[PDB]
Design a protein around this ligand. Structure first.
Ligand SMILES: NC(=O)c1ccc(F)c(F)c1
Ligand SMILES: [Ca+2]
Ligand SMILES: [Ca+2]
Ligand SMILES: [Cl-]
Lengths: 360, 365
């Protein structure tokens, strides 16, 4: 196995595959075949494959090498450098100018593979997939004993793709049109997979091709291919989480609401930061207090209809929403002091957020 | 005690005087700032018992004199959180201090000003002024060589030395040493004081970058620095610092000169295949050539060859590459000079263009 390639052509591929307990999982698979260098990183749950065209003389074959070391060496070389690689048994030689490196190797034969069959396929702009994941990702559970919440629902319905994420306390749902008639289907992508998929997306104009199997999801963009296993459980139905009949509607500036929440939060309990909301005619009052007897009060002029009520919220849950909205005005749709609240951009139905109240 | 101050006139003072704080304040009052309104000025003070940062804020709005202490981080965060241009009204009310701006209201618990720790008074024995740029140079040149929580406490600080028309800093952790001397333009008596690690950091933090020079005062047991409307004072570390003079190699006539960047990037790449713990690389110096190699237990190998200027006998010498990298990063120059002796002796490293900074790194087995 021998190739010579510009450092420049390796950098972004290396960045992506350095993404995805067993030493060989810390290695990259390198393969030269039919004029192409392929670089694969895996963690057994997901894999990223990148391809680089080889115009300079090259010899087929494969090996695996320490990924972080190989990446650091390449990154470390000067801009414009050319990188010549040759496999020498249990070592891979790397040369560029008067810099020389010998890396240990593990056999390509030992490198783990994920085969499976695609059941649902569609293409969409990167930008749309990025939008979907950013709108919802923060509501994924992290290390919940209900495994199926540690990730993100991808659902196809009609001509829309939809993401849903929830941790049982707050929920986020976003739908975007994809312009193709689609089968009704739902899968759960593990959180680490969501994160790696999002990192593959640079917001250039580039179609993303998605293929969903019973147990896997694959996304193709440019010369990269990402594959993850799916999470095997029963995701909650967002439709059953949306408040059935909110009778109280508050509209307020997103930024003013956010800043009042953030300031009030300073004098909330540091362990469990919550604030009390009091809604009344034309007005929202946010209050916090702490074990030191300190108190914050914010009063905001707001658009409001409904009965007066008091309701508490976890500060981070609301700030997370207001941060994901990045819009001028926000609508909060309330029911009562013991029920969850629906938050959305006042001027867009693309996404919705549901948040349980917090007792204070 | 009462004042009303525009947000942005209070914010950087609050940031600056919070410097010496934690984190985890050992006792509550050490997590507080002292606020004193007196003769048309708000003073803010934070302390950790070893040092204090004081800021003076002029009061253009109606105010009333008095003093209290309130939690620094909460007070800062409230002020930072208010919208730009916000007028921040403050009034002491016994056990609470009230903060109001627009329809934002906050109540903070106070501790009496009478109980705020207060660095004892002391006398200055030497005083000079110098550019902010010069002090930043002295500290950045040597800071990285200070020890980290060494049981030899004196090393966990930085030596400041005045001698003739020079101010000098020294730092070492016993393995490597950094010395930097800069002209002052006034003649100074001989003083040698150790500044505590956190004090060195605060000196750095307080150098804004404008035309305000720095006024320094040093006594037997304290140092003080004035910049703009800030006064930093620290207690000094009560120890005898090792002498840099007797640590500089005696006769390093083997003289190598190389491009700083080329040298740095070569050591950086070779470091990748150095032992993860010990970070050893080998240098083979030969006529106008440097060969850096690294290998680790798995017998991965890196080899960088560089053109350099060198005439002396060939030799082989081992260094912790992290130590070497720290020096090259702190030099920020075009060419470096390395002054060698033998494989079991320290190397002295300098900007090829200036003897103002010098670095001593001991070899590894
Ligand atoms: N059943 C659920 O998973 C759920 C998720 C988020 C909520 F806010 C909620 F009220 C319920
Ligand atoms: Ca104003
Ligand atoms: Ca000197
Ligand atoms: Cl290519």
């Amino acid at each position: 196995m021998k190739f010579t390639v510009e450092r420049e052509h390796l950098l972004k591929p290396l960045q992506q595959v350095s993404g995805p307990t067993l030493p060989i999982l810390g290695n990259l698979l390198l393969q030269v075949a039919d004029g192409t260098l392929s670089l694969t990183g895996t963690d057994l749950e997901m894999e990223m494959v990148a391809r680089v065209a080889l115009v300079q003389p090259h010899e087929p074959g494969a090996t695996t090498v320490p990924a972080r070391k190989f990446f650091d060496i390449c990154r470390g070389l000067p801009e414009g450098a050319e990188i010549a690689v040759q496999l020498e048994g249990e070592r891979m030689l790397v040369r560029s100018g008067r810099s020389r490196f010998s890396l240990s190797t593990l056999p390509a034969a030992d490198f783990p593979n994920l085969d499976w069959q695609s059941e649902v396929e569609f293409t969409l702009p990167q930008a749309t997939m990025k939008r979907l994941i950013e709108a919802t990702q923060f509501s994924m559970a992290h290390q919940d004993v209900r495994y199926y919440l540690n990730g993100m629902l991808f659902e196809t319905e009609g001509e829309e793709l939809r993401t849903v994420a929830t941790d049982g306390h707050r929920l986020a749902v976003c739908s975007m049109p994809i312009g193709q008639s689609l089968p009704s289907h739902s899968v759960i992508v593990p959180r680490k997979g969501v994160i790696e998929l999002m990192r593959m997306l640079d917001g250039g104009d580039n179609p993303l091709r998605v293929q969903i199997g019973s147990n896997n999801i694959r996304a193709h963009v440019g010369d990269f291919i990402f594959t993850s296993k799916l999470v095997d459980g029963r995701f909650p139905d967002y439709r059953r989480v949306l408040p059935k009949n909110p009778d109280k509607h508050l509209e307020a500036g997103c930024d003013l609401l956010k800043q009042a929440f953030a300031r009030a939060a300073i004098l909330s309990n540091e362990k469990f930061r919550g604030v009390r909301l009091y809604v009344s005619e034309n007005q929202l009052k946010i209050t916090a207090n702490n074990p030191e007897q300190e108190e914050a009060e914010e009063i905001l002029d707001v658009t409001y209809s409904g009965a007066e009520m008091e309701i508490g919220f976890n500060v981070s849950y609301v700030l997370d929403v207001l941060n994901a909205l990045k819009c001028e005005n926000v609508r909060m749709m309330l029911t009562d002091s013991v029920s969850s609240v629906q938050i959305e951009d006042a001027a867009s139905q693309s996404a919705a957020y549901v948040v349980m109240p917090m007792r204070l």
